[PDB]
């Protein structure tokens, strides 16, 4: 066709000449019925692709052509194919091309907002697409153009509102992040000046989330800082409140609005970041001021119960220990039975505690292992304890081994409560993290090749007795704690090679340990420093949020929701009040 050859033309007047044929035939929406594939949008997509005179003076007339066709579905109703951009409009394409005019025309052509574009820029509201492209003019054009706007109150199939979207795409890159901030607050005040009154934030995402909550779970950072600490104020922008106020200070003695951060109501921002949040690095986020002020406060508030619990634990250990040590090869038999029973009581208590702890985690997949290992250790200890006493009453053969295992472990478990007391606990932990990782990787290899050498030596010894494989492996292991042998004897008659071999061993395990030592050394040589400090900070935070509520081991089952915030002083305009928190100085 003429228009078919005008798929690539630059002169749509030809396609108007065949639009006379469009006037002739009763065939409507022949844009598909032409040669055009790729959903058929390719004509208008070609118009877009042209960018004639920095605009499309090609599109406008051909737009007028499709208009004149009176077709059931114009070419904007076209849906781009799945997996790359699914149902993506030529409109969306236009925005992608950053053409203001022809877009304004498409709108003027009667093109529609609500759509699904899929990409990795979700833009299901074309408004949001515009935002992703970072152009005000166009968003204001939506505001105006054609006449209506796209209600921000509208959400997509993911449920994610424009804001949520912004946050999704919100990146580390502080350039991009900055512009995003600008447009974020800008759109905030925009809709707030236009809606003007409705909740622009607080609309649940797929998993119900405030856009801020969404920030957390998505592990958003810079804009989290921004959204947290804001300044809006005039004209009515103080109805949005920007989460801030100030009064009674030479330098800014300020009040903060703890709303979704309130740490009790439902699942707080804290409650999110703590557990639910996946994270490359969460260690940063709790370092934010309006948090750590609250946190430290809550801590100061929370200690005596903590140190008490600690003390209890300690007592328990003492008991456990004595019960073990003074336990004979079988005060008095009375206090003996008392011992065992008391153990059993502690054991059941803990195992219950930690149990419903996991329950409370819904058996949440713990990538928190790095933070959570103590939890596990408790659990495992506990179960071993009670198991021990089980086989005590049942009078099973092996009990005391399991018992004392639970003991040794038990103490080793204790140092958990360092979490609170001292500040070098920080480095102890950061270390604990990287060091354990690297040490595992190491230990495997060490093990394996030592095993190799084991079979070597045993085999050559196979004709006093240096024979038992395990034994051989010991005689070989004692070289790494340096009680080892290396003695030469012509007894073996391949003595030469035997000793030669274990010498190779020595050299080798040495170079290995060296390798490791330096390796992890380097790891901390590159150091984010106070990142560790923060690592400690949150390490503490998790604890506080846990001691937030009682014991569903039911020593005290119900802890009050008694945490709360000061009542707000702010009746700005039609909104008449809030309920909030206080910071200071700086």
User: What is 494-519 written as a DSSP string?
Assistant: SHHHHHHHHHHHHHHHHHHHHHHHHH
What does the alpha-carbon distance between residue 7 and residue 36 come to, in Å, rounded to a whole number? 7
**CA-CA-CA-CA torsion for 49, 53, 58, 61, nearest 10 degrees?**
140
Cα–Cα dist 62/70, whole Å: 13
Question: Residue 18: in which H helix or E strand, if any?
Answer: none
How far apart are the C-alpha atoms of 395 and 406, rounded to whole Å? 18
Cβ count within 10 A of residue 401: 10
How big is the CA angle at 401 (ends 397 and 403), to the nearest 5 degrees?
A: 105
C-alpha closest to that of 286 among 540, 18, 571: 540
Q: What is the DSSP letter of 76?
A: G
Contacts of 429 (CB under 8 A, 6+ apart): 532, 535, 536, 539
What lies within 8 Å, CB to CB, of 44 at 6+ separation is 59, 62, 63, 66, 75, 76, 78, 90
3-state secondary structure string across 292-341 = HHHHHHHHHHHHHHHHHHHHHHHHHHHHHHHHHHCCCCCCHHHHHHHHHH
- Residue 58 per-residue DSSP state: T
Our CA angle for 380, 385, 390, nearest 5°, is 125
3-state SS, residue 232: coil
CATH of 1-288, one of 1.10.8.640, 3.30.300.30, 1.25.40.20, 3.40.50.300: 1.25.40.20
How far does the chain reach from its first CA to its final CA, in angstroms? 73
∠ CA(130), CA(67), CA(116), 5° rounding?
Answer: 35
Taking each continuous run of H as one helix and of E as one strand, the counts in the chain are: 25, 3
CB-based contact 570:241 (threshold 8 Å): yes
Please tell me the experimental approach by which this structure was elucidated.
cryo-EM
| Residue 151, helix vs strand vs coil | coil
Pseudo-torsion of CA 350, 356, 358, 359, nearest 10°? 170
Find tokens 């600008």 and name the residue.
182
Backbone angle region of 87, left / alpha / beta, with phi > 0 → left and psi within -120 to 50 → alpha: left
Reduced to 3 states, what is the DSSP secondary structure of residue 124?
coil
Assigned token pair, 495: 């003595």
**Distance (Å) of CA 54 to CA 64, 90, 94, 130:** 20, 18, 13, 18
For residue 123 the two structure tokens come to: 């833009």
Contact assessment for residue 129 and residue 95, using Cβ atoms and an 8 Å cutoff: yes
Tokens of 386: 């009670």
Q: How many CB atoms lie within 10 A of CB 526?
A: 6
Task: List the one residue out of 104, 70, 101, 74 whose CA is nearest residue 89.
Answer: 74
Q: How far apart, in whole angstroms, are the C-alpha atoms of residue 258 and residue 581?
A: 6
* Contact partners, residue 96, CB within 8 Å, separation at least 6: 129, 133
Structure tokens at 293: 């002020």
Handedness of CA 376, 377, 383, 386 (dihedral sign): negative
Count of other CB atoms within 10 angstroms of residue 490: 8
Find out whether 371 and 433 touch, Cβ atoms under 8 Å. Answer: no
Q: What share of the chain is helix, strand, coil (3-state, %, to 5)?
A: 60, 0, 40
Burial letters for 442-476: b for 16+ Cβ neighbours within 10 Å, e otherwise?
beeebeeebeebbebbbebbeeeebeeeeebbebb
Alpha-carbon distance 400 to 402, whole Å? 5
For 152-176, the DSSP string reads: TT---TT---HHHHHHHH--S-HHH
- Distance set, CA 24 to CA 17, 18, 46, 61 (Å): 11, 9, 25, 19
Which value in Å is the resolution of this experimental model?
A: 3.8
Residue ranges of the chain assigned to CATH 1.25.40.20: 1-288
Whether the CB-CB separation of 212 and 201 falls below 8 Å is answered with yes
Query: Assign residue 98 a region: left if phi > 0, alpha if psi is -120 to 50, beta otherwise?
Result: left
Task: Please list the residues that pair with 566 across neighbouring strands.
Answer: 580
Please count the CA atoms within 13 angstroms of the CA of 37 that sit on its side-chain side.
Answer: 0
Whole-angstrom distance, CA of residue 212 vs CA of residue 202:
9
Map residue 566 onto helix, strand or coil: strand
Nearest to 315 by CA among 417, 399, 175: 417
Nearest to 347 by CA among 322, 397, 312, 382: 382
| Contact indicator for 441, 520 with CB cutoff of 8 Å | no
Burial code (b: 16+ CB inside 10 Å, e: under 16) for 344-374 equals bebbebbbebbeebeeeeeeeeeebeebeeb
Compute the distance between CA of residue 413 and CA of residue 405 in angstroms, rounded to an integer.
12
List residues bridging with 244 in a β-sheet: 256
How buried is residue 239: exposed, middle or buried, by Cβ count under 10 Å (0-12/13-18/19+)? middle
Task: Please list, in sequence order, all residues whose beta carbon lies within 8 angstroms of the beta carbon of residue 552, skipping any fewer than 6 positions away.
Answer: 353, 356, 360
Buried b (16+ CB within 10 A) or exposed e, 560-572: eeeeebeebebee
What DSSP string describes 258-283?
Answer: -STT-SSSSS-HHHIIIII---S--T
Q: State the alpha helices, DSSP H only, in 478-585.
A: 495-525, 530-547
Please work out, in degrees rounded to the nearest 5, the angle formed at the alpha carbon of residue 105 by the alpha carbons of 99 and 108: 145
User: Taking a C-beta distance cutoff of 8 angstroms, is the pair 29, 68 a contact?
Assistant: no
Contacts of 504 (CB under 8 A, 6+ apart): none
- Under DSSP, the state recorded for 568 is P
Q: Are 222 and 172 in contact (CB under 8 A)?
A: yes
Residue with tokens 């081991």: 553
Q: From CA 426, how far away is CA 417, in angstroms rounded?
A: 13
Q: In what order do the strands lie in the sheet with 566-567?
A: 255-256, 579-582, 566-567
Partners of 255 in beta bridges: 582
- Kindly state the helix (H) or strand (E) to which residue 464 belongs, with its residue range: none
The two beta strands, 566-567 and 255-256, are: unpaired
> Residue 358: which of 347, 368, 343 has the closest Cα?
368
Q: How far apart are CA 509 and CA 446, in angstroms?
A: 7
């Amino acid at each position: 066709d003429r228009l078919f050859n005008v798929v690539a033309r630059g002169n749509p007047e030809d396609l108007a000449g065949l639009l006379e044929y469009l006037r002739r035939t009763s065939k409507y929406l022949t844009d598909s019925e032409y040669t055009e594939g790729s959903t058929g949008k390719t004509c208008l997509m070609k118009a877009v692709l042209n960018l004639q005179d920095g605009v499309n003076a090609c599109i406008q007339p051909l737009l007028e052509i499709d208009r004149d066709s009176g077709n059931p579905q114009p070419l904007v109703n076209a849906q781009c194919t799945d997996e790359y951009y699914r149902g993506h409009s030529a409109l969306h394409i236009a925005i992608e091309k950053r053409s203001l005019q022809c877009v304004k025309l498409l709108v003027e052509n009667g093109a529609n907002v609500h759509a699904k574009a899929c990409c990795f820029y979700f833009g299901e509201l074309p408004l949001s697409l515009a935002a992703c492209t970072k152009q005000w003019d166009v968003v204001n054009y939506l505001l105006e153009n054609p006449h209506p706007a796209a209600s921000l109150q509208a959400q997509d199939s993911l449920g994610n509102t424009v804001l949520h979207a912004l946050v999704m795409i919100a990146d580390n890159s502080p350039e991009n992040s900055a512009l995003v901030v600008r447009m974020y607050d800008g759109l905030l005040q925009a809709g707030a000046r236009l809606c003007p009154n409705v909740q622009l934030e607080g609309i649940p995402n797929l998993e119900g989330l405030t856009p801020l909550k969404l920030a957390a779970k998505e592990g958003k950072i810079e804009i989290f800082k921004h959204i947290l600490q804001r300044e809006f104020s005039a004209p009515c922008q103080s109805l949005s409140r920007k989460f801030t106020e100030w009064c009674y200070g030479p330098v800014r003695v300020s009040l903060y609005d703890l709303a979704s951060v309130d740490s009790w109501e439902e699942n707080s921002v804290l409650e999110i970041i703590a557990f639910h949040s996946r994270s490359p690095h969460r260690h940063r986020m709790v370092v934010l001021e309006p948090l750590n002020k609250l946190l430290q406060a809550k801590w100061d508030r929370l200690i005596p119960r903590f140190c008490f619990n600690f003390l209890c634990y300690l007592v328990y250990m003492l008991i456990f220990t004595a019960v073990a040590y003074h336990q004979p090869a079988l005060a008095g038999n009375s206090m003996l039975l008392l011992g065992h029973i008391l153990i059993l009581l502690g054991g059941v208590y803990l195992l219950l505690g930690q149990l419903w702890y996991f329950w409370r985690r819904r058996l949440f997949i713990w990538i928190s292992f790095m933070d959570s290992y103590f939890e596990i250790l408790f659990l495992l200890q506990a179960l071993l304890t009670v198991l021990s006493q089980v086989l005590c009453f049942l009078a099973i053969e092996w009990y005391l081994p399991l018992l004392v295992s639970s003991l040794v472990l038990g103490w080793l478990n204790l140092l958990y409560y360092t979490r609170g007391f001292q500040h070098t606990g920080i480095y102890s932990v950061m270390i604990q993290k990287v060091i354990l990782r690297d040490l595992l990787r190491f230990l495997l290899v060490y093990l394996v090749f030592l095993f190799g050498f084991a079979v070597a030596l045993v085999s050559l010894s196979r004709e006093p007795p240096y024979r038992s494989i395990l034994d051989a492996s010991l005689e070989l292991f004692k070289f790494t704690i340096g009680m080892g042998e290396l003695a030469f004897q012509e007894q073996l008659r391949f003595r030469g090679v035997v000793l030669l071999l274990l010498l190779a061993y020595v050299l080798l395990t040495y170079v290995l340990l060296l390798n490791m030592l330096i390796a992890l050394m380097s790891e901390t040589v590159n150091s984010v420093a106070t990142d560790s400090w923060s690592i400690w900070k949150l390490q503490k935070a998790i604890s506080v949020l846990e001691m937030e509520n009682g014991y569903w081991w039911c020593r005290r089952k119900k802890q009050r929701a008694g945490v709360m915030l000061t009542v707000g002083t702010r009746p700005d305009g039609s909104p008449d009040e809030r309920w909030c928190f206080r910071v200071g100085e700086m």
